[PDB]
Amino acid sequence: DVRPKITLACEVCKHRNYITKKNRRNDPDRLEIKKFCPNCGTHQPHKES
């Protein structure tokens, strides 16, 4: 599908908060960035599902 739609989930509270698009051909590895999770109160890195 070239453009899978992947969601980003938190870790401590485990909420699927953010969603982003990516190219699986060019990015076989999982997505690793940092965001702010509203209920947590502090920035915490997000892992895609």
Partner RNA sequence: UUUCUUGCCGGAGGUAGAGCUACUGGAUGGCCGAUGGGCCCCACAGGGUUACUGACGUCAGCCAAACUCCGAAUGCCGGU
Partner RNA sequence: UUGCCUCCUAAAAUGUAACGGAGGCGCCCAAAGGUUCCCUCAACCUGGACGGCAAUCAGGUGUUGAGUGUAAGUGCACAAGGGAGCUUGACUGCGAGACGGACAUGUCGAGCAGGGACGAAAGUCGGGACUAGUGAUCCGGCACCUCUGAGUGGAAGGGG
**Minimal distance in Å, beta carbon 36 to RNA?**
3
Q: In 3-state terms, what secondary structure has residue 49?
A: coil
Residue among 43, 34, 39 nearest 14 (CA):
39
Residue (30 or 43) nearer to Zn ion, CB:
43
Show contacts with Zn ion in window 19-38 (CB under 5 A): 37
**Cα–Cα nearest to 10, from 29, 26, 33, 27:** 33
Taking CB within 5 to 8 Å according to partner kind, which of RNA, Zn ion, none is near residue 36? Answer: RNA
* Minimum distance from residue 23 beta carbon to Zn ion (Å): 27
